[PDB]
Amino acid sequence: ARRKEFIMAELIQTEKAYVRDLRECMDTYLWEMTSGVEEIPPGIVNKELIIFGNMQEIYEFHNNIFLKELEKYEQLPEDVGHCFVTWADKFQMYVTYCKNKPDSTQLILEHAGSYFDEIQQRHGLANSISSYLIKPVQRITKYQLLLKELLTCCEEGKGEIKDGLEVMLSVPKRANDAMHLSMLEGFDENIESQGELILQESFQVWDPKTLIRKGRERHLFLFEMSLVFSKEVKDSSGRSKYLYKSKLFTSELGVTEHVEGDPCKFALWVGRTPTSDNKIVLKASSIENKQDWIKHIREVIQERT
């Protein structure tokens, strides 16, 4: 219980430091951009929303809700996992922040010049803007680290510690999934209408529709309402994009786990009956990847039927 106390105390102390840091970042760098009288390099003029992402939304969540929620567990460390599960929906704002991070970094690197560095020097600030902008990303990692530490000294399956850790691990994962989704080209359909993106991954796929039947690489996006097939292609400089190919409705999906001759293969079909004209065979990169997809596909099929 001594190690648990050190962890809980650090969780709360660093939460206070985090809230203070976001506040200072907005009161200095952000304020200067929105109310300052300094020359803003045209490349970043009034583009604060891109530079700072939704930092204000994140600050309000921790300052109005999360620190207070964590403090309720100041003397109940083994049960703090519940906080993360309970407020999981709020943590979706971190997916938004992390998704935007690459753009912010680039807008600064190519159009900011020494604008922020000069603000730092003139105001005698300890933290550079880059040091502040990475804090929300680092905060999710810190939560993962603290929850993992609690797992080493808590009863298996209690206090939602593992469930809370999973919420924290899913955040960077969903941000990465969204980055790949942003590479999909040619899907002329509302993305929001597909429901939430659950998984995205590359597979070797055998299609009954191609002129020549063979395993071809395809990058799949499993949404709550549909499974989208796309093909990764690269341009001259090696930049990848995914060309939209087709889409199956999850409510109509059927899955076959075992395919003779390759433990990494599984099959999908649509409608009541599988036929040589509708059966798709997929080869995953590993048995673990195959099992994860089978699990999630079975889940969307169950939800939609």
Please, how many CA atoms are within 13 Å of residue 77, restricted to the half-sphere of its CB? 22
- Classify domain 182-305 at the CATH topology level: PH-domain like (2.30.29)
Q: What percent helix, strand, coil does the chain show, rounded to 5?
A: 50, 20, 30
Which helix (DSSP H) or strand (DSSP E) does residue 270 occupy?
Answer: strand 265-270
Q: Where in the chain is the domain with CATH 2.30.29.30?
A: 182-305
Structure tokens at 82: 């519940």
- Write the CA distances from 217 to 232, 262, 284, integer angstroms: 8, 17, 10
How was it solved? X-ray
DSSP three-state, residue 230: strand
Provide the angle, in degrees to the nearest 10, between the axes of the packed helices 2-25 and 135-152: 170
How many Å apart are CA 52 and CA 146, to the nearest integer? 26
How many Å apart are CA 56 and CA 26, to the nearest integer? 8
How many Å apart are CA 72 and CA 76, to the nearest integer? 8
Torsion of CA 221, 240, 173, 92, to 10 degrees: -80
Q: Where in the chain is the domain with CATH 1.20.900.10?
A: 1-181
Enumerate long-range contacts of 105-112, CB under 8 Å, 24 or more apart: 105/130, 105/133, 107/43, 107/44, 107/47, 107/50, 107/51, 108/44, 108/51, 110/43, 111/41, 111/42, 111/43, 111/44, 112/41, 112/43, 112/44, 112/51
- Classify domain 1-181 at the CATH topology level: Dbl Homology Domain; Chain A (1.20.900)
Enumerate long-range contacts of 226-232, CB under 8 Å, 24 or more apart: 226/194, 226/195, 226/250, 227/253, 227/268, 227/297, 228/184, 228/187, 228/194, 229/205, 230/184, 230/187, 232/202
Query: Can you give the resolution of this entry in Å?
Result: 1.7
Enumerate long-range contacts of 12-19, CB under 8 Å, 24 or more apart: 12/67, 12/70, 12/71, 12/74, 14/142, 15/62, 15/66, 15/67, 15/70, 16/67, 18/62, 18/135, 18/139, 19/59, 19/62, 19/63, 19/67
- In terms of Cβ atoms closer than 10 Å to its own Cβ (0-12, 13-18, 19+), residue 185 is exposed
